[PDB]
Amino acid sequence: KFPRVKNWELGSITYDTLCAQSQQDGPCTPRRCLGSLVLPAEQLLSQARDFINQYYSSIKRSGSQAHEERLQEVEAEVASTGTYHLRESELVFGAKQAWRNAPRCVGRIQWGKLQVFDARDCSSAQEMFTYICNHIKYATNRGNLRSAITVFPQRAPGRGDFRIWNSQLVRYAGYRQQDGSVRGDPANVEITELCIQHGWTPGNGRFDVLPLLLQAPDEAPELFVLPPELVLEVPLEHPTLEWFAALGLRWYALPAVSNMLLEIGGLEFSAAPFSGWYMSTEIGTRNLCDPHRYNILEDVAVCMDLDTRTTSSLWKDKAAVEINLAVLHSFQLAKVTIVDHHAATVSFMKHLDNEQKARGGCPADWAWIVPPISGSLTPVFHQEMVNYILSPAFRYQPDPW
Amino acid sequence: GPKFPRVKNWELGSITYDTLCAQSQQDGPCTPRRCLGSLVLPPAEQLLSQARDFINQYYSSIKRSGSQAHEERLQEVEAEVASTGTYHLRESELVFGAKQAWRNAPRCVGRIQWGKLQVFDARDCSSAQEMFTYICNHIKYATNRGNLRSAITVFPQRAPGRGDFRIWNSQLVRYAGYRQQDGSVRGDPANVEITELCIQHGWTPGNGRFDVLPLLLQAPDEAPELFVLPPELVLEVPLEHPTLEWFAALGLRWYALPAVSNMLLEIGGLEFSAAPFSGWYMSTEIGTRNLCDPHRYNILEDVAVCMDLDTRTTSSLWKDKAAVEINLAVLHSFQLAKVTIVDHHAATVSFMKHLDNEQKARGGCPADWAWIVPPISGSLTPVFHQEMVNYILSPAFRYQPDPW
Numbered sequence: 001k002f003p004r005v006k007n008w009e010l011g012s013i014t015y016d017t018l019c020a021q022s023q024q025d026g027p028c029t030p031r032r033c034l035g036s037l038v039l040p041a042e043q044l045l046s047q048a049r050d051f052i053n054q055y056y057s058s059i060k061r062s063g064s065q066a067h068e069e070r071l072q073e074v075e076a077e078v079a080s081t082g083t084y085h086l087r088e089s090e091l092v093f094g095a096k097q098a099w100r101n102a103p104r105c106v107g108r109i110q111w112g113k114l115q116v117f118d119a120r121d122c123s124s125a126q127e128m129f130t131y132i133c134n135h136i137k138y139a140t141n142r143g144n145l146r147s148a149i150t151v152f153p154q155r156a157p158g159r160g161d162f163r164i165w166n167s168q169l170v171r172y173a174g175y176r177q178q179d180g181s182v183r184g185d186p187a188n189v190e191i192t193e194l195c196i197q198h199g200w201t202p203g204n205g206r207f208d209v210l211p212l213l214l215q216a217p218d219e220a221p222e223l224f225v226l227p228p229e230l231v232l233e234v235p236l237e238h239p240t241l242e243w244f245a246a247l248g249l250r251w252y253a254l255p256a257v258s259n260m261l262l263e264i265g266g267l268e269f270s271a272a273p274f275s276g277w278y279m280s281t282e283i284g285t286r287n288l289c290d291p292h293r294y295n296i297l298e299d300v301a302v303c304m305d306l307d308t309r310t311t312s313s314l315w316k317d318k319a320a321v322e323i324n325l326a327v328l329h330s331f332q333l334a335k336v337t338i339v340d341h342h343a344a345t346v347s348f349m350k351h352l353d354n355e356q357k358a359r360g361g362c363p364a365d366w367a368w369i370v371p372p373i374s375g376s377l378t379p380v381f382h383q384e385m386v387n388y389i390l391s392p393a394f395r396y397q398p399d400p401w
Numbered sequence: 402g403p404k405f406p407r408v409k410n411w412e413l414g415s416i417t418y419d420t421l422c423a424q425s426q427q428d429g430p431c432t433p434r435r436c437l438g439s440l441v442l443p444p445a446e447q448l449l450s451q452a453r454d455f456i457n458q459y460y461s462s463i464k465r466s467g468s469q470a471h472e473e474r475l476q477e478v479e480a481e482v483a484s485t486g487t488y489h490l491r492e493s494e495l496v497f498g499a500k501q502a503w504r505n506a507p508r509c510v511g512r513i514q515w516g517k518l519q520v521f522d523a524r525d526c527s528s529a530q531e532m533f534t535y536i537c538n539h540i541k542y543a544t545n546r547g548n549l550r551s552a553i554t555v556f557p558q559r560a561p562g563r564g565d566f567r568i569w570n571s572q573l574v575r576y577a578g579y580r581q582q583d584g585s586v587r588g589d590p591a592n593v594e595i596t597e598l599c600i601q602h603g604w605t606p607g608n609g610r611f612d613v614l615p616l617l618l619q620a621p622d623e624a625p626e627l628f629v630l631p632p633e634l635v636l637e638v639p640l641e642h643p644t645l646e647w648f649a650a651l652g653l654r655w656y657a658l659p660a661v662s663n664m665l666l667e668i669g670g671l672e673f674s675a676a677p678f679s680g681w682y683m684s685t686e687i688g689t690r691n692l693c694d695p696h697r698y699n700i701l702e703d704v705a706v707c708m709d710l711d712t713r714t715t716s717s718l719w720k721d722k723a724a725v726e727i728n729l730a731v732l733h734s735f736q737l738a739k740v741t742i743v744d745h746h747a748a749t750v751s752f753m754k755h756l757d758n759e760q761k762a763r764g765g766c767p768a769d770w771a772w773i774v775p776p777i778s779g780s781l782t783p784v785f786h787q788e789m790v791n792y793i794l795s796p797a798f799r800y801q802p803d804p805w
């Protein structure tokens with residue numbers, strides 16, 4: 001019934017009772033675990049009712065007059081039109097809850113602090129662009145980063161979706177070369193090629209910021225260039241290794257995810273970009289060291305004069321550590337908010353304890369929460385986790401092309 | 402495509418489908434409502450179905466499925482269970498079963514070696530003294546003066562109404578952990594309970610950080626008996642670093658032979674409660690888990706101080722820098738002393754080859770992602786980018802509760 005959850009460093013035990021609230025199935029069965037894989041009116045009515053019940057309970061007014069009447073408005077709207085609409089205060093609560101509920105997010109200690117921009121009165125791609133430019137300015141705040149989400153109009157039965165084609169608001173281009181190598185970020189070759197086809201004049205650098213492709217319902221997407229001054233970037237240098245600055249490496253300040261679906265009370269928001277601040281291992285380990293990304297390990301190790309001929313000299317491990325240190329030092333120097341993996345995972349353990357008290361559990365995906373270097377050096381490695389789907393939720397959605 | 406799990410490698414873009422999971426006859430701990438993949442601990446009628454399944458597996462592996470010899474063996478097994486409530490394996494059946502149990506183990510990254518296991522049949526064993534002899538022979542063979550060889554020794558199976566053969570120690574070689582008066586521990590904190598049981602049963606304890614424990618061996622229906630391993634049998638490696646001359650002065654060491662001794666080996670419904678097995682180390686198990694876990698030897702702060710690192714702030718990456726040098730010391734020292742070891746990069750590469758081999762041979766491979774990905778430098782290894790399906794196949798190694 002209720003799974004026992006143990007921490008192996010400290011010997012402490014808790015029981016997850018929150019998983020009983022899950023009404024949506026994951027990919028696992030008793031026959032096989034798939035935890036490591038990356039990917040009608042009556043049903044809508046009950047999702048809506050549950051959500052409204054969640055909202056009135058959060059403001060302590062459960063059972064009040066305002067509660068009963070709001071339930072009746074929703075019922076009347078769905079019965080007549082097949083759908084309904086959220087009040088701004090309900091949207092705000094719903095967005096925070098979807099963050100709180102996200103099992104892959106190590107940053108959830110911050111869940112209560114989220115600026116929510118209501119963009120549901122948007123009727124064109126041009127208006128979308130203005131809203132996005134305002135989000136970026138707010139979120140960036142000259143390096144003193146603030147968590148934010150902007151919510152565009154919900155999906156509707158009659159028509160096509162509002163969509164941002166880009167997976168993040170800020171990404172670097174990937175240019176496929178004559179010889180089948182890539183200049184820039186190999187993760188972005190396909191979106192880069194789409195941008196060119198839709199009329200963008202491409203650069204030829206390793207760190208060219210991509211334009212946005214924004215789609216209003218049932219229209220071809222439109223191209224918008226981000227004003228250079230809005231996109232804060234950090235040149236990478238190393239505290240003791242002088243030649244590192246000459247590698248010419250940089251990363252953008254703002255991690256801003258733009259391709260996920262936000263589901264609240266049965267309603268679905270197909271464009272709802274959100275942003276926080278980076279955990280340094282995302283940049284230092286994954287973006288720069290992954291073999292299928294910028295893949296810089298070998299170059300850094302040679303500058304460091306390490307023996308690259310054999311794996312047993314641990315040259316990959318040594319180079320990776322220095323790159324991560326360069327990221328942390330450079331962000332700190334440029335006064336841009338960042339968190340290291342030790343500090344982030346310590347705050348996550350506190351979030352786990354807060355949530356055990358508040359709700360009797362916390363859905364968490366161990367493979368995503370444990371950092372990609374120095375796993376067992378962090379307290380989360382030794383912590384058992386239960387993974388399940390609660391709503392409101394963020395959900396992956398297929399690329400619109 | 403097909404209705405079997407689709408499995409993707411995100412570095413290479415390649416896809417396979419797992420069809421082997423269809424052969425699974427035992428439930429794991431997950432359901433559609435919640436994943437429990439990260440948790441460490443998960444009649445004649447019943448026996449016969451498991452026995453028939455295993456005999457069918459054996460006859461398929463020798464390509465004699467449906468033959469007269471196959472049907473005759475099946476008839477011999479059920480007749481034996483009819484008269485006795487149990488049955489017994491042939492020598493070649495035990496050998497097949499033990500290798501298949503290793504092949505099936507989802508938490509083992511060393512499975513490229515599965516076909517090369519020396520299997521010692523100790524099913525004639527009738528006393529604690531004789532268990533000790535067999536165990537000493539295992540260690541001598543497996544250690545081979547540092548050129549390590551994979552092996553298992555199989556003691557008699559569980560029997561109706563008669564007590565079990567059990568080895569009380571979790572490994573054949575482990576260090577004592579001595580509880581101090583201030584509440585701290587000298588030696589290995591993992592071993593505090595077993596250390597205290599050895600003293601209760603008459604062992605005169607040392608007072609060092611690396612005292613090898615004696616064995617507590619239990620023959621059926623007797624109290625366990627205490628046996629000290631002759632020191633010349635236990636190969637150890639003093640730890641030094643290739644460039645940091647002071648590292649040798651910390652007096653650190655580790656033993657050569659990883660030999661798990663408390664797992665149950667299950668073959669065709671038969672239960673082997675004592676069947677210790679051994680291979681060689683992957684270096685991260687010593688360098689990262691044994692030496693750096695905060696609940697183990699916990700030496701990270703000590704080494705960082707000698708390295709002159711800023712241990713008062715997380716963002717200096719002092720833990721990461723120290724862990725790398727400790728892992729490097731382990732690899733260098735084993736290589737110097739000519740004792741077999743494998744680094745995490747070479748092991749995970751070889752496991753990627755094993756995955757490909759098994760895709761062709763059986764249509765999949767059960768694997769536990771959280772255990773296969775090494776505890777340092779995870780995404781620098783190929784296995785981090787590889788999706789994995791986890792399920793239980795028999796023959797199997799299974800955890801068993803401590804005898805005390």
Ligand code: HEM
Pocket residue numbers: 095099102104105106107108110114147148149260274275276277278279282339344368394
């Ligand atoms: C405030 C600082 C934050 C930090 C340090 C942080 C940290 C992280 C990290 C390290 C990941 C895994 C990233 C990856 O490997 O792709 C992640 C995932 C995620 N986070 Fe956060 N987060 C923050 C804020 C936010 C905010 C504001 C939201 C939404 C309101 C959010 C929702 C999510 C979601 C939905 C995922 C899963 C994304 C996916 O499947 O690709 N987080 N977080």
Ligand code: HEM
Pocket residue numbers: 503506508509510511512514518551552553664678679680681682683686743748772798
């Ligand atoms: C040939 C050298 C071998 C290497 C490098 C190797 C590697 C490993 C590693 C690194 C682990 C994880 C250990 C941990 O973190 O506790 C493991 C687990 C395991 N291996 Fe191996 N292995 C080898 C040989 C063997 C052999 C000979 C067997 C049995 C015949 C075996 C069966 C197992 C089993 C049953 C586990 C799970 C143990 C548990 O749940 O505590 N492996 N292996």
Ligand SMILES: Cc1cc(N)nc(C[C@@H]2CNC[C@@H]2OCCNCCc2cccc(F)c2)c1
Pocket residue numbers: 038039168255256257274275276277278279282396
């Ligand atoms: C195919 C697929 C499925 C899925 N769920 N997700 C993806 C994005 C991948 C995940 N791994 C790299 C890349 O996503 C990279 C962007 N991740 C930033 C997360 C983040 C960090 C800090 C603050 C935030 F607000 C958000 C792809």
Ligand SMILES: Cc1cc(N)nc(C[C@@H]2CNC[C@@H]2OCCNCCc2cccc(F)c2)c1
Pocket residue numbers: 441442511659660661678679680681682683800
């Ligand atoms: C409670 C519990 C359950 C379980 N399944 N397992 C344990 C042993 C723990 C697992 N993690 C550390 C420790 O096991 C330490 C010993 N593991 C060595 C595995 C190995 C390596 C190379 C060759 C071999 F033949 C065997 C405890």
Ligand SMILES: C[C@H](O)[C@H](O)[C@H]1CNc2nc(N)[nH]c(=O)c2N1
Pocket residue numbers: 036037038367368369411785786787788789
């Ligand atoms: C195959 C595996 O699930 C995949 O590489 C995952 C592992 N853990 C991860 N963890 C985080 N935070 N982000 C990721 O993209 C991944 N990728």
Ligand SMILES: C[C@H](O)[C@H](O)[C@H]1CNc2nc(N)[nH]c(=O)c2N1
Pocket residue numbers: 008381382383384385439440441771772773
């Ligand atoms: C909580 C978590 O399941 C636990 O700490 C696991 C994670 N992965 C591991 N992986 C290996 N190889 N060995 C272990 O002991 C563990 N411990």
Ligand SMILES: [Zn+2]
Pocket residue numbers: 028032033034035431435436437438
């Ligand atoms: Zn699962």
